[PDB]
Amino acid sequence: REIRNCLLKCISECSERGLVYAVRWAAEMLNGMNPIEMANEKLLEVEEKNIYLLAKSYFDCKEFERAAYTLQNCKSSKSIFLRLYSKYLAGTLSSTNREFYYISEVLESLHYQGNKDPYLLYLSGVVYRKRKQDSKAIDFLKSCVLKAPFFWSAWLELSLSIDSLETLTTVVSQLPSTHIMTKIFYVYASHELHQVNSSAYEKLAEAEIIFPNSRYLKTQRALLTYDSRL
Amino acid sequence: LREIRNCLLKCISECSERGLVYAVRWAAEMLNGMNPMANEKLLEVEEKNIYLLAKSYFDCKEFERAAYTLQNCKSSKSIFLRLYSKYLAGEKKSENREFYYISEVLESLHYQGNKDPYLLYLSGVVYRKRKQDSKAIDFLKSCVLKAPFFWSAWLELSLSIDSLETLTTVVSQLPSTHIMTKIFYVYASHELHQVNSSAYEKLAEAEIIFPNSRYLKTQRALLTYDSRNILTNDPAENLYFQ
């Protein structure tokens, strides 16, 4: 009955491959095989490993409602995030979606409880933008990226929440100036605002030395040369 | 900076776990956009980055791109993913060759010392689709002996079996008493509708291992029907096709 290591090894190898139906089955078996014999965050992730693995399996089979139901009493922010995302995926993120208010509320309660997991901060940041609360969206998205600096989707929503060169200059002065992503952001943002100057080209060159054969950076260079030319 | 690397890896791992596929794809592209008995795991380490990328494309349903990414990769995981990406891309285009190229690639690999189970699985699947049942059983049988908890291979095996004879035969070649051999026999018998005494015996034996397993619970309902709410549900869902 400690054989269930074989279920884990299967779940791992099949998810890697991505044999989703094989995983789903293995997860279902894994859960419901008897009682099994921030620091606090990872500890809850260990407690919910099996329950998460299951929900994610349902999620990868597009069985979203079931994925959310699976993690209904789960306290880890990974589980909470997945639950909330799965919920949204029934019927990117919009006000007309049936689950949207519910998400909002769940995220509000979590903020008053002093949660600041980046992916939930991200979610918060997204929802506030959609509700035309730009200055609050920036607040949450800024926090997110400080904690999760290589999480591109948060930088994009951040750029979308910024509507002036002032508001931009402000935010940029609150991010790690030396950090590679702060630079990659400033090039993206400056372009999307069309307030492209010397420093943007300077920073893009600095990024290209790190990522010489990146399609994204190549597309940015094209976009900068085109803005300057008008 | 080789820390930028590690932060991209931590992102890829956390975002994949969270279902954020587009975030992963980006991170992977960046990651591969910087300068640089069994030995299988050693090749997996070599191709970690190239794999991570292809899998990102694969999770965005960008199958052809995923396959092209791993074209020169030698690990059976990469090979499998490559060939599987092709199959799936092939199967969407249905609405046939392509299975041919896969077939051939799998043949050459089998003469070469290779019999990785997930490739055997792939072989097994492709032969069934080409109406070669007796050959599909051969490969799927090998697979499950090596990879006994890999459900998708047992299901394709059951699908490749069309008589109680062909079933009884195959079952006599699997570790009788191995757990999954029992779970299989219950599924297969039901899916062929020749259910007997022993099926109920074996299901009870499985249920003491997995007392709250949704799948086993569905099987029990399906057997108790066979002996003569869940029936209300979709047969495709209950047989785990879907």
Walk me through this protein's architecture:
Two copies of one chain form a homodimer. Chain A has 230 residues and is mainly alpha-helical. Chain A has a single domain, classed as Tetratricopeptide repeat domain (Serine Threonine Protein Phosphatase 5, Tetratricopeptide repeat, Alpha Horseshoe). Helix content of chain A is 70%, strand content 0%. Chain A is built from 14 helices and no strands. In chain A, helix 4 packs parallel to helix 6. Chain A starts with a helix and ends with a helix. The interface between A and B is large, with 46 and 47 residues. It is classed as cell cycle. The entry lists the keywords SAD phasing, sulfur, cell cycle. The assembly is dimeric.
User: CATH architecture of chain A, please?
Assistant: Alpha Horseshoe
CATH class type of chain A: Mainly Alpha
Count of alpha/pi helices of chain A = 14
Total number of beta strands of chain A: 0
Quick one: overall form of chain A? globular
Number of self-contained structural domains of chain A: 1
Distance between the termini of chain A: 70 Å
> Can you write the helix and strand succession of chain A as a string?
HHHHHHHHHHHHHH
CATH superfamily of chain A: Tetratricopeptide repeat domain
Structural class of chain A: mainly alpha
What oligomeric assembly is this protein in?
homodimer
**Main beta-sheet strand count, sense and barrel state of chain A:** none
Helix content of chain A: over 70%
List keywords for this structure.
homodimer; 230 residues; mainly alpha; Serine Threonine Protein Phosphatase 5, Tetratricopeptide repeat; 14 helices; globular; cell cycle; SAD phasing
